[PDB]
Structures are given as C-alpha cells and as structure tokens.
Design a protein around this nucleic acid. Structure first.
Lengths: 149, 101, 708, 64
RNA sequence: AAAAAAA
RNA sequence: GGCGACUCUCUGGUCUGUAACUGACGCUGAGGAGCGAAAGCGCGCCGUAAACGAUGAGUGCUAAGUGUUAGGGGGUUUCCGCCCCUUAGUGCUGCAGCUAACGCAUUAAGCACUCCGCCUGGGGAGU
C-alpha cells in the first residue's frame, strides 16, 4: 500500500558514486561481488586508458544515452490492449540503464567481461551500440502507439 | 437568385447535416460534418456543426441569400454552434424553430 | 494534396505567423471555392495527425516546432495539477498533470510542450522550462519539529510544505503565521527551502488572519519616512497665493454626498436648472496634484501603491491619512482647492458645453447617501425641514441623474446590478453580521454625475490629441461569450448577434429579461465571467460595459493613481498650456508603464479585498453549524454544487452528501441528475440547505441538502 | 414571489391582453409553472386557459 | 470563481 | 369505471354564506333496475374483472401540531399584507384508545347506535 523504500547501497569507494556500486551489484553473479568489483575497476581503467577522460565522465554519459524516457505498459481495459506510454521514474531510469548496460555487455563478442563492459560503456557514451538502441527501440515503439496514454 | 430561405439543421448524436432551402423547401445547398471529412467522434462535436453551417451558408450566399429562418431537428449538440455559424456567415436569423418529430 | 500541405506549412513557417482558426486560414489564403475549403480541412487534419501542426483547444492551428510548445502563465490548483494560461488569450488553456509541472509554481511564466495525445477533454502539456519565477516570498503557518521547522503555505496552490532549517527559524514558534523567503525551489523529490523573514504573530491572535492576507498579496505597509515628512509639512489650510488663477465658487451651493463613515471626500457636486430647461452640473474634484507634486516622496509612494485597498477591518490608503482626510478631502464648510468640470446638459442628457478649470470651493453641507434617500424616496419631512434650502437642488439632481441614466441605457450600457456583501466587524475585527450592499437612488445619482464627468474629460482630451490615460474595457472573449450564449439558450434566452460582434445592448437585453426571475443571479454571474476586465491604457479603445468610446477615471485622485495623473495632464495641457513636443514625448514614454502598473495594482487589490471577505464570511458561519438556510444553486460541477444564501455567502454541497441517489453531472445543462430518482439540481434552483462544516483557514463552508 | 393578479387586483385575465400573458410564457412559449411565477393556483388556471385561447387565436405561439 | 462602477 | 387541446350548445352534481320558507319530508336497503377495467366476440350483445385505500353506508363522540384546494368572516391594513377564526375537502405527523403484531389514530382500524353485504380449516373446487 505504501512504496517500500529501496535498499540504500554504499557509494563505490574509488568513484564515490552509488550509481557505480549499483552497477557492481547488477554485474554480481551468485553473490560474487568481488568478481564484479574487479571487472568494473578493470573496465574503467580500460575506458580511461583509451579515452583519456575520467571513467565517471564517460559512464554518466553512457547512462544518459541508455536511460529511457518513456516506456510501453500493457493496458487491457475491456479490449484496449493499449501500450500506455509511461514516464520512467528516475530510479527505474537508472535501473533500466544499468540492466541494459550489463545485459548487452555480457552478450558482446569481446573475450573478457572487463573489455566487454568497457566497450559497451564507450559505445553507449558515443550514443551508439546496442543498449542505446534498446532505449530508442522502446521510444520508437512508444512514439508508434503514442495515441493512447 | 432568392433572398429568404430556411436552414434545416439535423443534429443527431452521430452527425449534423445543414441543408438550406427556399421558402418552398427546395434545396439551395447543404453541408454535413461527414461532408467536411470529420469522422467518428468529430462529426458529433459542435465544432463540426459550426463548420457544417458555414460551408452550407457560403454555398447559399453564392445563390444570394440574406435572411434565414432556422429549423432544428434531433438531440445533437450542434444546433447552438451551427446557428451561430449562420449569423456569423452573414445571413440574419429571423426565427429558430425546434421541429424534432 | 502534398503540394498544398507543403504550401500551408511554409505559410505557417513564416516568422510573422500567429496561430489562426480554420476561418482565419481560409481568409488569409483567399480560399473562396468550396472544394479548396475541403482541401484545407483535409490538409489540416493530415498535418495534425503527422504532428507538424497543433490545434489548440480554441481551434487555432500553430506550428508546434516554432514552439513545440506554448508560452504562458501557470495557474496552479490546490490538488497539485495546473493549467497553462497562454499569452495569446485567443488560445485555450492547456492542462498540466502534477507529475509534468517540473518544479513550476503558481504564477510562473513557463514554456510547455504540447502532448500529441490527451487523456481527457482538454489539451495536455509538460513544463519544459521556467522563464520567470513568480513566487519569491510565501506566507504560511510555522510548525516546529524536533530538529527543523516547516511552514504550511496559506496559498493552497503551493501543495508542498516549505522546509525551514534550524538557522532560518528566526524566532518563529508553533502556530505563528510567518513570511518565508524562498532560498531554494523544489527540485526532483526535494521540497522548497526557506528562511523566516517576518513573524506576523500567532494564528489565533486578532487581526493576524487579515495581516496574513496583506503579506500574501504583498500589499504596501507603512509609509516611507520622507513621504510622512512631506505629509506632516503640508499645510492644514490653503495659502492665499494658491487662490491665484482659480475660479471662486465659495458662494455657490455645493455639497458632498458620501457614506457616513467616509473621511476621504473626493467629489463635490451642484446642479442648477437653467431657464431653457437644461441643467448645469458642476463636478468639483479634490486637487491632489497641487499637494502631491511630480517626483515627490508621496508621489513615488502613491505610484507604488497604485490604488487604496479596502479590506474588511481597515483601509490601506494610496496617500497618507493627513492629506487624504485633511487638506485634499472636501471637508464641510472649509475652503478647498479643486479641479472642476462644469457641464450644461440638455433635455436628452447631452453635454452641449463643458469647461475644465481650477477653482476654490466651500462646501455648504456634507450629506450622506442615507439622508439624501430619506429626502427623495422616503419623503421624510423632518430631514427636508432640516435641509429645506437644499431639497430643491436634490430634486433637480434626481431628475438629471435619471435623464443621464436613460441615455446611458439607450446607448446600450450594461447595468450589472448584483447583490454584493458588506461584512460588518467590531473593534477587535470579529464578525458581527454579513449584509447585502444595496445601491440606493443617492449612490446611483452620484454615479451618473461622476460618469458624465469622466466621459466628458476623456472626450475633451481625445480631441485635443495629446498623450493621456483612459479607462478601457475591451470586447469580451468570443469563446467565453459563445459558451455564455449557449448557457442562456438552455433557459430559453435567445440573443440577437454572434460572439465576435455583440453590441452591449444585446447583453442588457438578457439582464432585463431575467430580472425578478430565480435564474437572474446565475445568468448575471456567468455573463460577468465571459466579460474582460477593465484596465488603464494610453489609447482610447472605448469602454464596452458603459457602451462609450471615451472614458477615463478623473473623479477619485485621493485613492487612484490614474486619476492623479489625469489631474496632472489637465494641469499640464489646459491650465499651463504646455502642449510642446518635448512635454508630449515625455508623457508618451511614461504612460504605458504607469497604465500597466496601476492595472496590476488594481487586480491585486480586488483579489485581496475579496479574500478578506471570503475569510470573514467563513468566520461568520462558524456559529451557524446545524442551522438551515434557503439558498440558490450558484454553480454546479462534477463533484457537487455551490449554494448562494440571501446574504451572498456561498458554500459547497459535495456529492457525497447527496446520499439519496447516484448523481451524474450534465455539462451542457449545468445540472446534477439522479439516475434512479430522476432528481435534477440545476443552476438557479432554490433549495434549503443546512450547514454541516465550516473551515475558516481554507474559507470553506460545507452544506447538505434538506429539501428542494 | 407574489402573485401578480392578487397583487395588482386583477380578477379577469383576458386572452386578448397578449403582453400581460407574455409575462408568463417561456421564450420557447411554454406556460411558466406556478412555482416559478409565484402565481395563485386559482389564477394560474385562469391564466392557462387564457393562454390556450391566445395560442388558438395565433396571438401567442405554440412553439417559439 | 471571475463585471462595471462606487468607496 | 373514471375525467387533461380550444370554443360553443345542452345537462348533472359539489362547496361556502344567509336563514326567508318547508317542518323529520330521514337513514339503510335483500330483490329489481341502471351504470360498468378489460375484453370477449358477433354497433349491439357481453356484464364478469387487486372492478381492492387490501378498509359497506349513515351519524354522534374523543390531544395536538403542520401543509394544501375552494369558500366565509374579523383584525389592523387604503390595498396587497401577514395575523386570527371558521367551513368543505385533500395530506403528513401524532395523543387517549385500539391492535396478534404491524399499524390505525377526529379522512379510526378509537368510543357508540341503525341497516345491508360477507366469513366459519387446507385441499378437492369455483371442479
């Protein structure tokens, strides 16, 4: 009945960003937060070595481009079947940002995850790749059925 | 070339037709919400009825009308906006008359 | 089809393009054939579907992209939503959902993106940008918590509590009404933060309720020290030097007719009947421009004040009490400087001749409206005997005022005679009674004399063709009037005209037909709601409500800054003869800003006076919980219906209290219809209500239906 | 809300006095109820007839 | 809710 | 049973006021005679029908308080105007009483008297 409070994660110790921590917890498998803490700190050294920019400048830019603005929600009142355009709550923006970032990074062709995650962030930051596309995809779809809401 | 005429407005829940006639009921011109490309909910609205009265009126002004008697039919929302489309098009309204059967 | 759509879009893409209707697009494109008209409607629908144009809910097509947007003012609601009021008043209001406000507060000038689809009857939009912030200060009740304070705003349109940090308390205690200054606006999930600028007092202390309203609106407080020094140095009597170049009218029979409690006597009048049967009317107004000179301390303050504000328990005056009540006031049987307008008026109410000049008067008697009515109407022999020399003049004044009224109504003026409340308070500011304000013969007599003075001055200066200030009332909003015409047609009242070209006499042709009917009050009320507000302007654009081409305010300079300017321009152009190009250009530059400012200060005033009345009306009904009253349905909505009592107190019947049936709102008929019972509660229906609850803080009165 | 005819001492409502009658019909021409007019039942009956005689002789309309 | 006007 | 457009012709009854006249000429009414939803059917026959306030008719009597229809009178009031008083209904609420209860309560289902109709378990069977 009353919106449950989301669990207050700690800031990532080296970037002081609770966003970066949330990425670690998204990447973490079978409670192996160590593996994911390593992978990211390996991925962000890869970003900083290539770009020269701070990984935080790029990662926040990457999230901006992945983060959705409007989403499709199924509504079946009587008939309807209306894909109601819904504005993504700011917490659900980051959620879907980090989910897609990680989900598509794992699917990439590169050998190691630290490189795969680095390259997906670098592609996301350049407003390209697959995770940015996925946001576009649902917006193209939300624009397509924008007649409802 | 006739001056006095009736403006028969049939405002239904689906549509608003506006014929304009002479005193003998011979049709000078007409226009409907459906004739102006409105469809579905839009045909019912008083905006389409207003707009249907204008194109009907501007058709009649060519034939050279000046005064209109008005007859309204039906339960639609168009009659008030359509009539004020006939006074706004230029043709003076002598008398309205609800002739809903 | 595509070439025509492009040609329409290019036309709308021109920099001079404003949003136009289908008819205004038809005229502008010179479409005369019926088939080209079909093309246009088909092009407009196809472009609107593509989102390349947007129809506003006033049926005006605009290129969104040059906006994708509409610039306008936020009008917030207490339930967290808002409307955009566009700058272009021809455009319709855009609904803004609470989630789409994006930190925009009540009154903020914003840019709103238009939503291609709507979830209701009106066009939706999202606030993309805030161009100007309206609210900087907030009045509210301070509440104390363990480690911080908050202030609950008195403006309920501010739906979030203002966070006061522990250092921004500045001595405010639990229950104190407080003036907060906003240090931060709401952002994301954070409320606004602010610091307590001023403590007004405790909310339960006498007069703090009205003192919270004064501060809410930002009404002017104490006079500056230099203004009060100027006032205290101003002589209590006329200097002999000031009698030079003034017409001596001290030997004439000149009277003031005012309220019994009035001390700021602006006007004094005389009427002499001439041998031919024409009347000579003298109107003699307080020469405030003499005492208050241009760029004086009082002048700078009066401009800032713009008008006197008349709240329930007090008056906030435009000029200090030493001048307004002392040397400017036309006090009885003392010499007073005036600026006169003297008028010979024929048997049809036509001003054949007039003169405007400076004079000195000595008023023969200070009369009251009550006394003048008792002489004329009640035929009171005791008062006639008391004022035996003045009775013949009063009878000539009555006849002349009737003459002027007849011509006024024949010209097609709209006599809007509604029952206004007068709240009666005691010395502590507690409500004693709420009575109807009745306009008598004596008030309608002076009204006509100030009106004919006010038109006469306005006509004189129009033809002189010099920079001047007018009191204009523009033609009503065609959409608002179109709705009003539709409304009265349900009661049967058919009006001759269209909403774009109505003559003032047409609307009166309604108010007469409804006179002494149950539906009078509400048709009256809804007619008002379709009218524009009158403002000040340097162009003589006419006055719709009075059905006149020339009108200004000349007759009340003590309490109106536009009248005090009219006095200066009279002294500049006629008396001093200063009609030079450098004088004209000086006034031509200043009058637009003055006219805009004083018009703002008037609206501010009227809003503030009302708010105090509605507060004290609510205070009055606190002790009437459980009592039954007859009333008349003054407004119906989807949530309930408002009920106006005989004293002009209004309340809500909420639909929850209508327990006998499920009631559906009919928007066209303005009626709540029971589904099962078939009970119909319409606008204008007399019902008997009972007082259920009264909230003074919110100004709410809550009824239930006893019987029809 | 007083009855015009008990007020103005009017025993006989005549169908020919159109302008009087016209004080009691609607704008559509329908007969105004007694409630709304404040008329006496007696006279309302009287009036009503008058009107129906007036409407028959095309002095008043049936439908405006 | 909503207007002149007046004060 | 019933009776709602308007006008006219013709005709029945009702109430209010005065008491000039008549002088108990009244009341009920089996039978009979007439009228009579809806039909039924063939303008006639038909003649029964929640044709049931679910309450014969008549009269006298027994707290109020309030609304309405048509009247009468008084008060001041010019007159409206309220106010008071009454009569004939038509309504609500509610004593005393009555009821098995529910209710009825001066429009009694209260207290009395006259006359008529009508009932005496359910079903069989209104056969």
């Amino acid at each position: 009945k009353g919106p449950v409070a989301k669990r207050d994660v700690l800031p990532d110790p080296i970037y002081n960003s609770k966003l970066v921590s949330r990425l670690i917890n998204k990447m973490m498998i079978d409670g192996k937060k160590g593996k994911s803490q390593t992978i990211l700190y390996k991925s962000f050294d890869i970003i900083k070595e290539r770009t020269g920019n701070d990984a935080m400048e790029v990662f926040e830019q990457a999230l901006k481009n992945i983060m959705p603005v409007l989403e499709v929600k199924a509504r079946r009142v009587g008939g309807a079947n209306y894909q109601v355009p819904v504005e993504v709550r700011p917490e659900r923006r980051t959620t879907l940002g980090l989910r897609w970032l990680v989900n598509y990074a794992r699917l990439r062709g590169e050998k190691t995850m630290e490189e795969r995650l680095a390259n997906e962030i670098l592609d996301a930051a350049n407003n390209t790749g697959a995770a940015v596309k996925k946001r576009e995809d649902t917006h193209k779809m939300a624009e397509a059925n924008k007649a409802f809401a | 070339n006739i001056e006095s005429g009736i403006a028969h407005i049939r405002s239904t829940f689906n549509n608003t037709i506006v014929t304009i006639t002479d005193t003998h009921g011979n049709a000078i011109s007409w226009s409907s919400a459906g004739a102006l490309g409105f469809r579905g909910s839009r045909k019912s609205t008083p905006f389409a009825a207003q707009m249907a009265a204008e194109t009907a009126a501007k058709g009649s002004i060519e034939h050279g009308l000046k005064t209109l008697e008005v007859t309204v039919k039906g339960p639609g929302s168009g009659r008030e906006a359509a009539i004020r489309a006939l006074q706004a098009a230029g043709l003076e309204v002598t008398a309205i008359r609800d002739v809903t059967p | 089809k595509e070439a025509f759509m492009e040609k329409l879009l290019s036309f709308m893409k021109e920099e001079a393009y404003k949003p136009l209707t289908v008819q205004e697009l038809e005229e502008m494109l010179n479409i005369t054939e019926a088939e080209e008209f079909k093309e246009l409607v088909k092009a407009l629908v196809a472009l609107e579907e593509k989102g390349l144009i947007v129809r506003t809910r006033s049926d005006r097509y605009g290129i969104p992209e040059k906006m994708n947007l509409i610039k306008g003012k936020i009008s917030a609601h207490a339930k967290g939503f808002a409307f955009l009021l566009p700058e272009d008043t021809s455009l319709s209001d855009v609904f803004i959902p609470p989630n789409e406000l994006n930190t925009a507060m009540n009154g903020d000038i914003v840019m709103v993106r238009l939503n291609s689809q709507s979830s209701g009857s009106r066009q939706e939009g999202t606030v993309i940008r805030i161009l100007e912030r309206a609210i900087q200060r907030v009045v509210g009740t301070y509440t104390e918590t363990r480690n911080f304070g908050f202030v609950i705003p008195d403006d309920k349109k501010i739906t979030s509590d203002i966070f006061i940090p522990k250092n921004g308390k500045n001595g405010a205690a639990e229950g104190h009404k407080v003036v907060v200054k906003l240090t931060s606006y709401p952002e994301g999930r954070m409320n606004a933060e602010g610091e307590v600028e001023t403590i007004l007092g405790h909310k339960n202390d006498p007069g703090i309720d009205i003192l919270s309203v004064i501060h809410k609106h930002g009404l002017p407080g104490e006079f500056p020290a230099d203004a009060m020094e100027q006032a205290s140095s101003t002589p209590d009597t006329i200097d002999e030097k000031d009698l030079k170049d003034r017409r001596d009218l001290r030997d004439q029979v000149i009277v003031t007719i005012d309220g019994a409690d009035a001390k700021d006597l602006d006007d004094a009048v005389t009427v002499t009947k001439l041998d031919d049967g024409s009347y000579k009317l003298g109107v003699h107004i307080a020469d405030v421009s003499h005492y208050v000179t241009e760029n004086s301390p009082i002048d700078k303050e009066a401009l800032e004040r713009g008008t006197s504000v008349y709240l329930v328990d007090r008056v906030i005056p435009m000029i200090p009490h030493r001048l307004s009540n002392g040397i400017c006031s036309l006090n009885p049987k003392v010499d007073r400087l005036t600026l006169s307008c003297e008028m010979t008026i024929n048997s049809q109410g036509q001003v054949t001749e007039h003169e405007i000049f400076q004079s000195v008067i000595k008023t023969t008697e200070r009369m009251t409206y009550s006394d003048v009515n008792k002489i004329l109407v009640d035929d009171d022999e005791e008062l006639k005997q008391k004022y035996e020399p003045l009775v013949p003049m009063f009878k000539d004044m009555e006849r002349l005022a009737q003459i002027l009224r007849d011509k006024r109504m024949d010209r097609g003026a709209v006599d809007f005679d509604f029952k206004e409340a007068k709240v009666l308070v005691d010395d502590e500011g507690a409500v004693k009674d709420v009575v109807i304000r009745e306009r008598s013969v004596a008030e309608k007599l002076i009204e006509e004399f100030m009106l004919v003075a006010n038109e006469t001055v306005a006509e004189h200066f129009h033809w002189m063709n010099v920079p001047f200030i007018y009191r204009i009332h523009e033609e009503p909003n065609a959409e608002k009037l179109q709705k009003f015409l539709e409304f009265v047609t349900t009661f049967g009242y058919v009006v001759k005209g269209t909403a774009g070209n109505i003559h003032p006499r047409a609307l009166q042709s309604i108010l007469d037909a409804v006179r002494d009917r149950p539906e009078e009050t509400v048709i009256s009320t809804v007619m008002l709601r379709s009218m524009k507000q009158a403002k000040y302007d340097p162009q003589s654009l006419g006055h719709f409500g009075l059905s006149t081409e020339f009108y200004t305010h000349f007759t009340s300079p003590i309490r109106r800054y536009p009248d005090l300017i009219v006095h200066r321009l009279i002294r500049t152009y006629l008396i001093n003869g200063k009609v030079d190009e450098a004088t004209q250009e000086k006034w031509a530059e200043r009058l637009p800003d003055i006219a805009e400012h004083t018009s703002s200060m008037e609206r501010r005033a009227v809003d503030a006076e009302r708010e105090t009345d509605d507060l004290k009306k609510a205070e009055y009904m606190l002790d009437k919980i459980g009592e039954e009253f007859d009333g008349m349905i003054s407004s119906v909505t989807n949530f309930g219906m408002f009920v106006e009592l005989p004293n002009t107190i209004e309340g809500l019947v909420h639909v929850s209290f209508m327990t006998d049936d499920y009631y559906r709102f009919d928007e066209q008929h303005f009626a709540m219809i029971g589904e099962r019972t078939g009970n119909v509660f319409r606008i204008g229906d007399e019902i008997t209500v009972k007082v259920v609850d009264v909230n003074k803080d919110e100004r709410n009165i809550d009824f239930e239906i006893v019987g029809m | 809300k007083v009855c015009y005819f008990t007020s103005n001492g009017i025993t006989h409502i005549d169908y020919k006095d159109v302008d009087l009658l016209k004080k009691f019909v609607s704008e559509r021409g329908k007969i105004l109820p007694r409630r709304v007019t404040g008329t006496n039942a007696k006279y309302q009956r009287k009036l009503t007839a008058a009107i129906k005689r007036a409407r028959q002789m095309a002095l008043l309309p049936y439908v405006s």
